[PDB]
């Protein structure tokens, strides 16, 4: 487990708020990139917001992206969306979480 | 309750008396750990209302002590704010978020 | 030797499961079960 990462985010995303999401990576010695992204749930069909961030010794392998769910881009309907995916993609790793 | 017995203690005194706007807050944080060779820095996030408003990194001095949290308490903090501090450290193969 | 375009993949963590020292994950019901429930060198049995 010599290479590791943390992404940290609000407990609840507020729809229509400019949520700021930090990334930190560890054990890396050549620069790379990541795309912290907010996607529809379950289906991952619609990217609601995405940010692209550079990780390097010059940034001390830390960055943040500012991401939002625009209120009108949600599918709406009779009972409203209660969950969304936060995803990261990068060389070396990807994961997502509800 | 760290499984790795690796800790991060914020030296601050939690005070009910307020910090004044724009003043330099100066907090010490001590990462006591079996693995202090590997904790080259800790990282911090300042949270105001719901949002991570500031973030950064705090490096190891040669005396085996660290950059304090030296931040102006900027206007986005004013009702109250919350500091969180973290690091990941490695054993021989394992890792823990502290 | 070569400079890779594709990067080296990471582990993923055991999350709520107990991490055994190998990197395998087992249920927290098996920690201090009294059986060596991690394969190879048990860790689930440590200091109970």
């Amino acid at each position: 487990q010599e290479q590791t990462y943390v992404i940290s985010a609000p407990k609840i995303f507020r729809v229509g708020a400019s949520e700021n999401i930090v990334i930190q990576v560890y054990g890396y010695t050549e620069a790379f990139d990541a795309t912290i992204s907010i996607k529809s749930y379950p289906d991952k069909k619609f990217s609601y917001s995405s940010g692209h961030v550079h990780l390097s010794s010059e940034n001390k392998f830390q960055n943040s992206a500012i991401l939002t769910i625009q209120p009108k881009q949600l599918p709406g309907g009779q009972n409203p969306v209660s969950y969304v995916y936060l995803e990261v993609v990068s060389k070396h790793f990807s994961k997502s979480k509800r | 309750s760290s499984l790795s017995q690796s800790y991060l203690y914020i030296d601050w005194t939690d005070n009910h008396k307020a910090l004044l706007v724009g003043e330099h807050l100066n907090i010490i944080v001590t990462p006591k750990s079996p693995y202090i060779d590997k904790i080259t820095h800790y990282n911090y996030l300042i949270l105001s209302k719901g949002k991570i408003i500031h973030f950064g990194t705090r490096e190891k001095f040669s005396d085996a002590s660290y950059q304090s949290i030296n931040i102006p308490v900027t206007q986005n903090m004013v009702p109250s704010s919350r500091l969180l501090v973290y690091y990941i450290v490695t054993g021989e193969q394992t890792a823990e978020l502290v | 030797s070569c400079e890779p375009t594709r990067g080296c993949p990471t582990e993923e963590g055991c999350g709520e499961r107990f991490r055994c020292f190998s990197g395998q994950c087992i249920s927290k019901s098996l920690v201090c079960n009294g059986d060596s429930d991690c394969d190879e060198d048990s860790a689930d049995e440590d200091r109970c």
């Binding site: 487990q1 943390v6 | - | 963590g13 999350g15």
Partner: peptide, 21 residues
């Protein structure tokens, strides 16, 4: 948070909190 370093706050769930400041 999302991390590979062996934790997930998915093991925790809220209470109607009342600790005061």
């Amino acid at each position: 948070f999302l991390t590979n370093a062996n934790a997930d706050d998915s093991q925790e769930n809220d209470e109607p909190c009342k600790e005061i400041l």
